[PDB]
């Protein structure tokens, strides 16, 4: 991809596939509703 992807997974296998694929790179799951979104986003912007 060039633009960041938007995954549409009603059944929920792509989301777990993403966790497994990027687990080695310390992938973290967040949400737009969560208040920790700002700090989680900022941390990624600094350290991968």
């Amino acid at each position: 991809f060039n633009r960041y992807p938007l995954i549409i997974d009603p059944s929920g296998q792509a989301t777990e596939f993403i966790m497994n694929e990027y687990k080695d790179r310390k992938i973290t799951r967040t949400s737009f509703l969560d208040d920790a979104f700002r700090k989680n986003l900022e941390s990624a912007l600094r350290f991968g």
Partner: protein, 49 residues
């Protein structure tokens, strides 16, 4: 990078977290709170006074 700092009689208290190794490990990186910003502390860093 190794660093050598002279004139320790004018010691800057900013090194207090660095000298005390008040590091934070999270996400696989080592974080040091130098002043008010977080810096990824490379393991090869060494400082001499």
């Amino acid at each position: 990078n190794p660093l050598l700092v002279q004139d320790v009689e004018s010691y800057d208290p900013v090194l207090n977290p660095v000298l005390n190794r008040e590091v934070r490990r999270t996400g696989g990186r080592v974080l040091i709170t130098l002043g008010d910003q977080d810096i990824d502390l490379s393991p090869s860093f060494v400082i001499f006074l």
